[PDB]
């Protein structure tokens, strides 16, 4: 967990996206999803919502729509949730309401929703919606204009990790209903990683091997996780 | 494509799933697409092609696969699967309750002719009972999905995803190439044309056989000769790789 919304919006600008998606998990401990989206509107405006922020999300969102769906479930909630917030912020920054939102004081969840309720007076319910639609439009075009080198490179980055997360997640339920307490750590280990570090792929093999100790179906999964320890492990016996 | 529901259902019994999922596309041609009509044809067809308890249990494997987190069946492959499940439940109801006879004939009918048969037979089960039955069978089914052999599911998975992972990646290459800003690049247009055709070739394929690897390689080769962008390269690499390791892992397997 990071210390600030400012650090999370840094990760976003730093193309750190697996990390930035934890932003809504941060606001969870620092204060329903009705409340949630409004916290992130407050949080983003007080933390320097800009055009660059929108534009760098349009990469992330474009990655989300990829047919290979690297971001799914928990991560996909994170992504869409935040996106629901980005549009109101987009309405606010455009019609110059961003100020009534910006403050000094350290507010509480109840007090936040309080002023956002009051601020609703500055925007008729009918126009809020009209701008929301236009801001959506203006966004989705930037989603289309998203530089494909940036999108692509981002994708490997995310999916490098993400793939194993599902591959492993699936290895678990298949095993539970077919050692288990063991794998959950590999699930919880990998859960924490933002990227596959060459040091991280090392700790993986330190898992794969340790399972062998405790089924023909488990096979092709390890083969898809850490092939090399297998090739070693099998040849070791073949010389008996 | 295949010429017979018997052929398709055979594939389902054999375990050839990507092929089995091609069924509702055949049914759409054999008859000439409101989903209710399409589910109607599937029910008729499956009941004449020897719907049975084993058909259900194997289909359970397929579904269990569709629910993996790696999500091997997306989009149209997914629509196939779900549309077939909507036909499945009525058949389970008709099977348990001895209604199938009214659905069984050797007379080769038309779409309009089957939809009429379907409405005629609608009067042999009162709606309320159909819905109760329908849920009982759904219960009976989803339990079998929870119980599907982990061996059998895991095997279907590797061999569906084997093809299917390629399918989605190639679609994502395609849209990115289209969406790329390439002013100098005079080959972009002929490179897009290559990916589209690769996408098209692969769309018909249910497994990676020697032929497939070879065609894929022919496309990927031509693409390299078209002088791709930096980002395109990662895609080309994944699409036709050389997994000397995996080669060496499976031999040893």
Numbering used by the authors:
A (entry chain B): 1 to 31, 39 to 185, 196 to 231, 234 to 259
B (entry chain A): 1 to 32, 38 to 258
What does the paper say about this structure?
Lpg0393 is a newly identified Legionella effector classified as a hypothetical protein. Through X-ray crystallographic analysis, we show that Lpg0393 contains a Vps9-like domain, which is structurally most similar to the catalytic core of human Rabex-5 that activates the endosomal Rab proteins Rab5, Rab21 and Rab22. This work identifies the first example of a bacterial guanine-nucleotide exchange factor that is active towards the Rab5 sub-cluster members, implying that the activation of these Rab proteins might be advantageous for the intracellular survival of Legionella.
We subsequently prepared a construct having a deletion of the C-terminal 17 residue segment, which was predicted to have an unstructured random coil conformation. This construct, which is referred to as Lpg0393Δ17, was crystallized and its crystal structure was determined by the single wavelength anomalous dispersion method. Lpg0393Δ17 adopts an all α-helical tertiary structure containing 12 α-helices that are arranged to form two physically distinct domains. The N-terminal domain contains seven α-helices and makes roughly a 90° angle with the C-terminal domain that forms a helical bundle structure. The asymmetric unit of the crystal contained four molecules of Lpg0393Δ17 that formed two homodimer-like pairs, mainly through the association between two C-terminal domains. Probably due to fairly extensive intermolecular interactions, the conformations of the two C-terminal helices, α11 and α12, are different between the two Lpg0393Δ17 molecules involved in the dimer formation. Remarkably, the domain organization of Rabex-5 is reversed in comparison with that of Lpg0393Δ17, which comprises the N-terminal Vps9-like domain followed by the C-terminal helix bundle. Notably, as predicted by the initial bioinformatics, Asp313 and Tyr354 of Rabex-5 are conserved as Asp41 and Tyr84 in the Vps9-like domain of Lpg0393.
